[PDB]
Swiss-Prot record, chain A:
Occurrences of domain Peptidase S1 (ranges): 13-238
Native species: Bos taurus
Protein name (database record): Chymotrypsinogen A
Keywords in alphabetical order: Digestion, Disulfide bond, Hydrolase, Protease, Secreted, Serine protease, Zymogen
First-level EC class: hydrolase
Curated annotation (Swiss-Prot), chain B:
Family as reported in the entry's similarity comment: Belongs to the venom Kunitz-type family. Sea anemone type 2 potassium channel toxin subfamily.
Highest taxon, organism lineage: Eukaryota
CDD domains cross-referenced by the UniProt entry: Kunitz_SHPI
Domain BPTI/Kunitz inhibitor: 3-53
Site (Reactive bond for trypsin) location in chain: K13, G14
GO cellular component, as recorded: extracellular space; nematocyst
Pfam families linked to this entry: Kunitz_BPTI
Keywords, comma-separated and alphabetical: Aspartic protease inhibitor, Disulfide bond, Nematocyst, Protease inhibitor, Secreted, Serine protease inhibitor
Organism, scientific name: Stichodactyla helianthus (Sun anemone)
Protein name, per record: PI-stichotoxin-She2a
Keyword Cell cycle: no
Disulfide bridge map: C3-C53, C12-C36, C28-C49
Location within or outside the cell: Secreted; Nematocyst
InterPro entries, sorted: Kunitz_BPTI, Kunitz_BPTI_sf, Prtase_inh_Kunz-CS, TFPI/VKTCI-like
């Protein structure tokens, strides 16, 4: 897990940049039945995708893997049906806390150079404030259509104390902030990954969740804190 | 007076086309909703927005 066959390249989503095609192979696009992209997600193995609960995914939507340019027909993409949706029961529609949903596919994704899994952390992993990580997706590049090509951005993790100086009590323990650094997640990025590179491998630290209603690049983005939710993830996989 | 509520995108990072009733302009109008914390002035279709305001 967490080792793209095609190496991402970063300069070191608003004010992001274009991904090397295929370089974030756990990234999926969640599309409705009329074909519109509404959220992102991440492959965590060949049968399961993790995304955000507020994305409201149903068995009518589909998971699209292996995609780079949504305006292109030259990509060998996989249009994967969803067998069942598992929204975290503790998801709070009020505070957007515990913002995570698992999707079990009707048929397994076929892993390839351009399609493979991100690593998941253990509940006790520590991803230090100030760590430079990466987020990706097809959300808007300016706060109106979503961009055709996959975007990426590097951005620093914030401490929750420092994140609270912007957002106050809206920040819960099951959230982690990142950004306020010249880039911003934006509409259509939800449910996609925030990854940090731990031990030569990319690990899912955050799920794109919420932030500035205008995708301001000077305020922190907020992400579902995967370490706080990964025990629920493992129990859901085990039981279903 | 639900149509008098303002366009609210909310803070979620979803891409959800919707329609709202613009007072200034007096029309039903398309906007990108983020997926959470929306208010009443938020409809799935233009027909649906018009068929309850106008």
């Amino acid at each position: 897990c967490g080792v793209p066959a095609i190496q991402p390249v970063l300069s070191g989503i608003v004010n992001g940049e274009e991904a090397v095609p295929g370089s974030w192979p756990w990234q999926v696009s969640l599309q409705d039945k009329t074909g519109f992209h509404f959220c992102g997600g991440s492959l965590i193995n060949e049968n399961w995708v993790v995304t955000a609960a507020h994305c409201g995914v149903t068995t009518s939507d589909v998971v699209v893997a292996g995609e780079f340019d949504q305006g292109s027909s030259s990509e060998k993409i996989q249009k994967l049906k969803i067998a069942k949706v598992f929204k975290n029961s503790k998801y709070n529609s009020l505070t957007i806390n515990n913002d995570i949903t698992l999707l079990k596919l009707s048929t397994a994704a076929s892993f390839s150079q351009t399609v493979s899994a991100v690593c998941l952390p253990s509940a006790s992993d520590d991803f230090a404030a100030g760590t430079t990580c990466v987020t990706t997706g097809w959300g808007l590049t300016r706060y109106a259509n979503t961009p055709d090509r996959l975007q990426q951005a590097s951005l620093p993790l914030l401490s929750n104390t420092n994140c609270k100086k912007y957002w106050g009590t809206k920040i819960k323990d099951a959230m982690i902030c990142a950004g306020a650094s010249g880039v911003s997640s934006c509409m259509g990025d939800s449910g996609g990954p925030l990854v940090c590179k731990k031990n030569g491998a990319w690990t899912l630290v955050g799920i794109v969740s919420w932030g500035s209603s205008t995708c301001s690049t000077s305020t922190p983005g907020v992400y579902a804190r995967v370490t706080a939710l990964v025990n629920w993830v493992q129990q859901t996989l085990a039981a279903n | 007076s639900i149509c008098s509520e303002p366009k609210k995108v909310g803070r979620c990072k979803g891409y959800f086309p919707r329609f709202y009733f613009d007072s200034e302009t007096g029309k039903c109008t398309p906007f990108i909703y983020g997926g959470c914390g929306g208010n009443g002035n938020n409809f799935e279709t233009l027909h649906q927005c018009r068929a309850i305001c106008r």
